[PDB]
Amino acid sequence: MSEMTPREIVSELDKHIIGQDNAKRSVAIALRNRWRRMQLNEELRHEVTPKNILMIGPTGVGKTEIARRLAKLANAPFIKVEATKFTEVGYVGKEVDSIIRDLTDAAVKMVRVQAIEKNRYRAEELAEERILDVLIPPAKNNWGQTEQQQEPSAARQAFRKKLREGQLDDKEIEKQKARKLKIKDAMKLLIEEEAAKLVNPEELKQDAIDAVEQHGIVFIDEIDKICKRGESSGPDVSREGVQRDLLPLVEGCTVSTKHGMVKTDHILFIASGAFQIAKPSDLIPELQGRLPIRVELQALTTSDFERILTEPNASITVQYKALMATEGVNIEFTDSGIKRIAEAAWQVNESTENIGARRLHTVLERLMEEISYDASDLSGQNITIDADYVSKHLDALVADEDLSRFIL
Amino acid sequence: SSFHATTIFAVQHKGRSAMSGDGQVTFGQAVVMKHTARKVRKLFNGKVLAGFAGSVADAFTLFEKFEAKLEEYNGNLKRAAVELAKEWRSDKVLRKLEAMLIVMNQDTLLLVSGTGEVIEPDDGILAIGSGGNYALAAGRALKKHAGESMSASEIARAALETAGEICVYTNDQIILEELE
Ligand SMILES: Nc1ncnc2c1ncn2[C@@H]1O[C@H](COP(=O)(O)OP(=O)(O)O)[C@@H](O)[C@H]1O
Structure with a gap:
């Protein structure tokens, strides 16, 4: 609890x-x-x-x-x-x-999805028992020791480690089934058709x-x-x-x-x-x-902003770095842009109408329109985003009031 | 007949910001009902002076629509000034309304009219209601003349004072307000 x-x-x-x-x-x-x-x-x-x-x-x-x-x-x-x-x-x-x-x-x-990593990792070791079962069957009449079961593995667990690197073969496994399919399918299947056996009566309700x-x-x-x-x-x-x-x-x-x-x-x-x-x-x-x-x-500050721009753990800014990294770009925001970044929010919010922390969001994605686009070019290249930067794509915008009206 | 305007005078000198008004309630042609009324209020965490001229329903009433819209924009008189005008100019019941509204802040200063005017005094003196002009004539007069020799606060006090002296519809008991 x-x-x-x-x-x-x-x-x-x-x-x-x-x-x-x-x-x-x-x-x-x-x-x-x-x-x-x-x-x-x-x-x-x-x-x-x-x-x-x-x-x-x-x-x-x-x-x-x-x-x-x-x-x-x-x-x-x-x-x-x-x-x-x-x-x-x-x-x-x-x-x-x-x-x-x-x-x-x-x-x-919410109850659903918050049950597929509690009971997911519990049944990827139950969808295997269903393929190491069709590639080599544990021959009729298990002579109970539970330690002559890891003993099929005398080749069975040589196929278990071989499920992660060599697939796409034609197999057929056991309102059940009786069906003849293929393995990269089926792997994506069983899973699904197994969360079902991970009981979903008067439990996903009653407790939901x-x-x-x-x-x-x-x-x-x-x-x-x-x-x-x-x-x-x-x-x-x-x-x-x-x-x-x-x-x-x-x-x-x-x-x-x-x-x-x-x-x-x-x-x-x-x-x-x-x-x-x-x-x-x-x-x-x-x-x-x-x-x-x-x-x-009470309404936030300029500082408050600056700080919302970085001290949030999901930080906006970062959202950038990482997003932006994906195309091969390091990006790095100065103290002193994160300064103007805010600085703008605040100046804009004060002329048109003020929408809250909200502005940063828009001010930003606009900063980057340049970077955010050309990004897949920068493959490695890295960039310094800082006051002098900021103001080059901002100042006149923020300047133009009546534009901002539209586009911030 | 009707109740007469109160006189109210706002002035802004050497960075002090001040609003004086009489109390005299002159009913009918000639009759006087009261000698004291508050129509100068402090608005918005003593950040603004506003005096109205009129009825305290109308009075109170306008005042809040100025408030509401002052918050509605975080300190910009001019802006809110305006957006009130719009509101006042349009409303059936206040658009007809006679008197005006004096609004001022730490910085600056505005006439605001039933009719959707909004006015900015070049010289930091505004004035409404019965004796208006008489006090306007005192205001502008003193500032021009004993700026150094007197204060914000003071100059306004006096405005009114002179008014009641030429003016039947203005009386000696003055309310005085300033910001800090
Ligand atoms: N005080 C703050 N600290 C961190 N983020 C904030 C703060 N204020 C607003 N935000 C962020 O900016 C936007 C405003 O948040 P929201 O809670 O929906 O605003 P509100 O409740 O004030 O109408 C959201 O994206 C929010 O997460």
């Missing part, structure tokens, strides 16, 4: 989300206040109430990714539903118990169910755009409603679905958004109060 202490939770955070400590902090305080529970009895296993979180602040500084990530290391199943959607001011038809239904549909194509149930985490994005305070950001309280609908979810219900009936009850909720338009004080009271833990995030 998972847990992690408060700080532990944080620290893996600072691994991919620069700054906003306060932020992290809370979310972890929610995720232990979580664990804690379990460890009680039955009374209070069921009278204490997922400490759901309200995420006030500007855009692109990481409310989402703070959640997204928290959850990945919780190893919780997770989904982010935009608040908008349930509005349909195009007037369609939106039901909110859907949300829970998709927090299962990952809670699966447990998934959601135990908990993930839903991040209800934008909540603020669904509540009133008049003028420009009120049509009707034909939005107020979606706060209502919502309630139950957060406030605790069962729900109908596909793989099994699910209990929202204990699910964790993380409600986002910026409120230049209203004020959290402005939710329906009901909601207001299921959002116990409130926290601010």
Whole structure:
């Protein structure tokens, strides 16, 4: 099982989300206040109430990714539903118990794929027993010693080591089979047709169910755009409603679905958004109060950037190096470009409109349009990417405001 | 008849940034209902001075749409100034609205009008409402004349003061605001 202490939770955070400590902090305080529970009895296993979180602040500084990530290391199943959607001011038809239904549909194509390296390496030593079986059969009547089985190997395990270097031969092996095929096929087959025997009844469900149930985490994005305070950001309280609908979810219900009936009850909720338009004080009271833990995030810096450009472990930048290396190019970003790199983000974000950390992403892939293209030429060649570089393909762009409008 | 404008005066001198306004609420032709009202507020973490001229519904109301849009762009008056104009010029209920809006920051200074104007005073003095001109005439007057001899804060105080002195619709009790 998972847990992690408060700080532990944080620290893996600072691994991919620069700054906003306060932020992290809370979310972890929610995720232990979580664990804690379990460890009680039955009374209070069921009278204490997922400490759901309200995420006030500007855009692109990481409310989402703070959640997204928290959850990945919780190893919780997770989904982010935009608040908008349930509005349909195009007037369609939106039901909110859907949300829970998709927090299962990952809670699966999550259980699945998170079962093919736990039970994959367990059955490449079971797809071999099925070819060292057709090239040379362990002659009828095994005289039980389990050590006269590694004794077929007296040539059998000479073919076992010869499966990795010489294949493409015509063979046929044992709703079963009885089929005559070929070996590089078949090798790619059995595998598949073997994960099946790696039992998938009321296990990939029931426990996938447990998934959601135990908990993930839903991040209800934008909540603020669904509540009133008049003028420009009120049509009707034909939005107020979606706060209502919502309630139950957060406030605790069962729900109908596909793989099994699910209990929202204990699910964790993380409600986002910026409120230049209203004020959290402005939710329906009901909601207001299921959002116990409130926290601010604040806009990142120039530095903050620079640092997001490199101190993220998946770093953007690196994404480059490696990507870029693949064509035979070392690439290497100075202190002093990683400086302008940011520097631009910030200047651009300040003239057009500011989209968050977001800009770096675009500013970059643009830096490289040159390199990133010609790359397969540079076969070995290496390049120095630095201020003086940067500014040559940037400055006038960033310069041209109205271009940036289009193309950054 | 109607309630008369309040007079309000903003000025920006030797890098101090200042807004004075009267309290006088002059109802009907001649009648006075109150002698004190706050229509000069501090907005955005004391970062901006804004005085309105008008009704405190209208007043309050505009103010937040200036807020909202100030956040909505991280400190750029001009920008938000504008995008309010658009908003005010268009809205059915405020587009008709008479008075204007004085907005200023650490740096710079703006008239903003129901009608979708946005104005920039060459000389760092703006002024609205009843006695406007009288105080404008005081403002510009002093700055030009005892810039050295007096302050931001001071010059504005005085604007109003003079106003109430020529002006029936302006009165001695002045509210004063400055940024840091
Ligand atoms: N504080 C930050 N530290 C690291 N990366 C960030 C930070 N803020 C934003 N980002 C990155 O830039 C984009 C913004 O993140 P996201 O969480 O979706 O923004 P927001 O929640 O603020 O609307 C994503 O690519 C995100 O991973």
